[PDB]
Symmetry: D2
C-alpha cells in the first residue's frame, strides 16, 4: 500500500494547453482519500503561486500551495542548507533570478558564493563568461535541472542541461544538479510528503525525468503512457517501471 | 549541532595496514557520548563480520555489527526494494557473489532479473559476455561502486567503475550505481543512522568518494587531510567541504 | 571522376558466410578497368594472406595481396613511424600478437614502449592490469579499432572499443585509435591507393565505420544499403553519404 | 631530416602582446634555408591578411600570405570539398561569418546545407536555437575548433568547443571539427606544405592542441616549453613529443 504520491506536472495531469481529465481526477481522488501528495516540476519560470493559479484556472485543479514543489524551491533549500556566502550569480529567467535574490542571495557577478544556472532564453556570451569566471574563483556551481532540451511550440530547443554542459566544459567543474531525476529534489519532495521512502511512489509520463528519478533514488514508479514516453517505447526501456498504465484512471488506491 | 555521523573506513580511521590513533579515538569518543554513527565503505570483498573483526583485532575498535554498512549490503537492500525476479548474475569476488545468493538471488547467467557488478580480480571475457547478453535481454544493471581504480600494494589497478564502463559502452545502458558518492548507499546509511538529513555529517579522507557523497546528496561534510586527499590539494577543490581538519582529534562535538 | 576506391570487406562485397554477387562483380569490374583499389578492414584476427585466400576460396574474388589493408597492418605501420622502443605489450588474438612480434616488437609486459589493444576473446583481469600498469608508466597507448561491439553468431558481444574504454577509464589516457573511422588507417590506405584524397571514394555498408570514415576524413562516400545500415535508416542519418545505392551493380565508373 | 614545418602561431613565435625573438628568428632561418613551412592557427577572428600584417608590424616577421593557414580557411576548404548546398548558418565573429558568405555560402537560418560554429562573443540563445533547429533538419554540423577555453586578458573564457558541446548535447549530433588537433586542418596544411607526412614536423607550445595534433595524425612533433605547456609539466605528459626544447634557437636544421 502506497502512502504518499510524488507527481509530475506537465505531461501527467495535463499536456501543453490541453488537459487530461484522468489526471485532474487523480488529484481529486487523492484529496478525497486525504492521501498526501506533492507535485514536482523541473520548471523554473513559474512561481508556486503561478503554478497553483494555472492549475485551478486552466485545469479545475485546486491544490494547496505547499503541494507544489519546483526545482527553484529545491535549489534555494539546497543553497540554504549548504550555508555559504549569501551571494549568488544567477543565469536564468527573471523569475528564478528574483526568487534567489528574495531568498537572501544578492546578485554578485564578481565573487558570488554560488553560481546558479537554469534555462535563460536571453543567454549571452557575457553571462556565460561571468559564470565561468566566478566558478573558476571557487563559487559553488549549481544547476537547477539537467534537461538537455526544452520542448516549445517552436520545437526542441536547448535546455538548461545543455547550457550547464557548456559551463562544465569551460570550467572543468561538474555542477551539482538539483532537479529530476537527481537526488536533492526527490529527497526534499519526499520530506514534504511526510512518508518513508518505501511508502512513496513517483508518478509521471516521462521515463527519463520521472521514472529514472524513481529508479535512481530507490522510489517506486508509476509510468503513464500519456505525455512524452509513448506506449510503444515501453518494451524497450532499460528498466521497467514498477507499474505502467495508459491512464491514471486505471490506478486503484 | 550534529546528531549523527557517517564515516568512511579506510583512509579515515586507519590507513592501509597502518593505523590512525586519532581515528580510533574518534569512534571511541562517539561511543562515549552515545552519538549514533555508521561506518560506510565501498569495499565489496569483506563481510560486515570480517570488517568488525579487523577493526577490533587490528585497530582497537570494537563496534556493533549494525554500525558497519557496505556497498554489498546497500546493493542487496536496493535489490530487495525494487523487487524483481529473485535471480541475478554477479560479477565480483566470491564474497559478493555469496552474499547475493544467500540474500535469495540464485545465480542465473541466462535470464537473470538483475546483473550486479563489482570488482572482480578474476574478470574474464566470458563473464563480461554473460553480463552483456543478460543486460541486453532486460536485466536490471547495477554497479556496486563507481571507483575507477582500486589502490593495491601493486599500484593503481582497474576498479569496479572501469569494468562498469566497459559494460555500459557494450550495452548502451547506464548502470544504477549504489556506492559512494551515489544516493542509495547514503540514503540507506542515513536511514540506519536514525537522524534527519540536516542533522548528519559525512566524515572522510577522500574528496571524490566521501565529500562529494555529502555535497551531491545534501549532507554536511568533514574532510580530514589524512588519507587520499592531501592537505595541499584542498585549496583547489571545486567545492569546499563544510569543515577541514588535519586530524579527527581536532573535532569537538 | 573517381580514380581510386577504398572498400570495406564484410557487409559490402559479401555478408557473413553468405556472398553478394554484386560485390564480387564490383571488384572484378574494377580489375577490368584497371582502377586502383584497396580493401580496408578493421578485423585484426585474419592475416592479409588468410583474407586473400578466403576471398578466392569462398567468394570467387582473386585480388593481389597488396590490395588488402587491415587495422593490424595500419597499427604496425604507425608503430614503425612513431619509432619508440622496439617493445610492446599486446592484448588481442594470437594473430595480432604474432604480427606485432614479427614486426620487431618483442613482448615486454613490464616497460613496453607501446601498449597495443585489439579484441581479445580471452581477456582476463591480469592482462588488463598488465596493460594498465604499463600505460601508467608511459607506454604509448594504441587501439586497433573503436568498434564497441563485435557481431558474432552468438550475438552482439563486447568489441575492442569497449575494452579500450575500460583501459581509458582506468588510466585516464585516451588511446590513439588506428582503425576506421579514424584518420591513420584511412591516410595509409589512401597512400597505398596512390591517388589524391579528392580523387578517392570510400565504399561500404556500415554508416558508422565506413561512411563516417569518409566524412570525418574528407573523403567521398558510397553507401550500399546491403549489410549493417538498413535502407530505411538512411533518411535519418545525420550526414548523408555522397551516394547511396541498393546494390554495387548500380555503380557506373 | 625534416623537409617541411607546420608551426603554431600564438605561444610559439610570440606570446600575447609580447614577442619571442627566438621564434621570429626560427621563421627567418627557415626562409634562409628555403625550407617550406605553414603557420597553422585555430584562430577564426583574424583573416590571413590581418595575421600577415600583425606578424610584420608587431613581430618583424614578413611571410607570404600563402604560408598562413587558419581554421577558417580549413573549414571553407572542407565545405567546398563535401559539396552540399551553397548555404550555411554561421555562429561566430563577424570575420568568420563574412569569410563563409564570401566563399559562396549565403546565410540561411532556416534550411542551410551547413551549420558552422566557431567562437562568438555575442552568442545568444536565439542563435543557438537557430543552429539547433537547422542541425535537426539535417544540416552538416561543423565546428571550427575544439578548444574548450579561450584565454583573454579577462581570464579563461568559454571557447568554441564549449559552445559546440552545448549544441552536440541539444541535437545529439557530434560536430565534425576542423581545427587542431583534428585531422582536416592538419591534412590540408600538410598538403600546402608540399611534403610527405613523415617528412613534416609540427612545432608548437601547446601540448593539447599542437603536439596532440602531431601524435594523433602521425606527424612528428617539436614541443617548445615556451607558451602554454610549462617545462615542469612535460615529464607527466601521457605521450612525449619527439623533441622538447626550451627555445627554438636550440633547433638545428
Amino acid at each position: 500500500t502506497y502512502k504518499g504520491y510524488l507527481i509530475d506536472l506537465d505531461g501527467t495531469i495535463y499536456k501543453g494547453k490541453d488537459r487530461i481529465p484522468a489526471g485532474e481526477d487523480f488529484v481529486k481522488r487523492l484529496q478525497e482519500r486525504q492521501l498526501p501528495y506533492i507535485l514536482v516540476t523541473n520548471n523554473t519560470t513559474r512561481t508556486p503561486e503561478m503554478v497553483q493559479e494555472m492549475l485551478a484556472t486552466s485545469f479545475n485543479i485546486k491544490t494547496p500551495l505547499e503541494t507544489i514543489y519546483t526545482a527553484t524551491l529545491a535549489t534555494i533549500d539546497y543553497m540554504n542548507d549548504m550555508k555559504r556566502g549569501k551571494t549568488a550569480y544567477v543565469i536564468g529567467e527573471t523569475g528564478l533570478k528574483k526568487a534567489v535574490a528574495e531568498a537572501g542571495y544578492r546578485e554578485d557577478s564578481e565573487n558570488p558564493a554560488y553560481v546558479v544556472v537554469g534555462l535563460d532564453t536571453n543567454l549571452t556570451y557575457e553571462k556565460l563568461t561571468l559564470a565561468t569566471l566566478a566558478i573558476q574563483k571557487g563559487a559553488v556551481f549549481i544547476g537547477t535541472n539537467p534537461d538537455l532540451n526544452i520542448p516549445t511550440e517552436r520545437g526542441l530547443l536547448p535546455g538548461a542541461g545543455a547550457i550547464l554542459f557548456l559551463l562544465e566544459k569551460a570550467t572543468r567543474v561538474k555542477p551539482i544538479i538539483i532537479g529530476k531525476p537527481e537526488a536533492v529534489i526527490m529527497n526534499k519532495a519526499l520530506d514534504r510528503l511526510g512518508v518513508k521512502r518505501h511508502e512513496a511512489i513517483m508518478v509521471g509520463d516521462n521515463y527519463l525525468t520521472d521514472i529514472t528519478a524513481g529508479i535512481k533514488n530507490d522510489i517506486a514508479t508509476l509510468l503513464v503512457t500519456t505525455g512524452f514516453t509513448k506506449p510503444e517505447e515501453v518494451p524497450a526501456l532499460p528498466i521497467q517501471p514498477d507499474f505502467v498504465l495508459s491512464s491514471l484512471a486505471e490506478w486503484d488506491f
